[PDB]
Each structure stands twice: as C-alpha cells, then as structure tokens.
Amino acid sequence: GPSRVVYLGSIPYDQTEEQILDLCSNVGPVINLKMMFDPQTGRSKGYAFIEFRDLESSASAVRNLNGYQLGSRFLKCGYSSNSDISG
C-alpha cells in the first residue's frame, strides 16, 4: 500500500548525506535517511533510502526527484519500504 519510504538512486558518488538531506528536506520533512556506502572504502554506493514524515512528502519525492538532474546524473526515485531503510 502507501509508503513514507522512498529509494533515491543514481546519486552522484560525491554527494554527501548532508546534501541529500537538504535535497529531500526541500521536498518535505525527513524522519530517517540511510545512505549506502562501501563497508571497506566508505565510498558512496550512489543510492539512499529516505523516510518522510508523511505520505504527501514521499509522493512528492517520487514526483519531483525521479528524473531530477543532479550534476551530470539523472536521479531515480520510487517507493520503498520499512524493510529497506531498516536493513
């Protein structure tokens, strides 16, 4: 059914968690954010899970961030679940 959680993919590898939190906060209030990193190098894997406070905000993220041009990359954004953001 509906979800507060989205995935955000194709993120430039140099984007920080702070930057992605700013991008998402613009869309709406964020209550959790998990950026994926390589366990050894710490290098970004170029995707994240974001949980918004409400359903309107996650829907807005899917609408506004899917295909959003961030530097040279085109973001992908769709619905995810509690399982994804919890690991």
Q: What share of the chain is helix, strand, coil (3-state, %, to 5)?
A: 30, 35, 35
Q: Name the one residue in this structure whose structure tokens are 């679940």.
A: 81
Beta bridge partners of 70: 73
Method: X-ray
- Closest-CA residue to 73 (of 36, 35, 46): 46
Separate counts of helices (H) and strands (E) for the chain: 3, 6
Secondary element (H or E) of residue 13? none
How far is 21 from 26, CA to CA, in rounded Å? 9
Do the beta carbons of residue 15 and residue 86 sit within 8 Å? no
Kindly provide the resolution of this structure in angstroms, with one decimal: 1.8
CATH top-level class of 1-87: alpha beta
| Residues in Cβ contact with 86 at an 8 Å cutoff, skipping those fewer than 6 apart | none
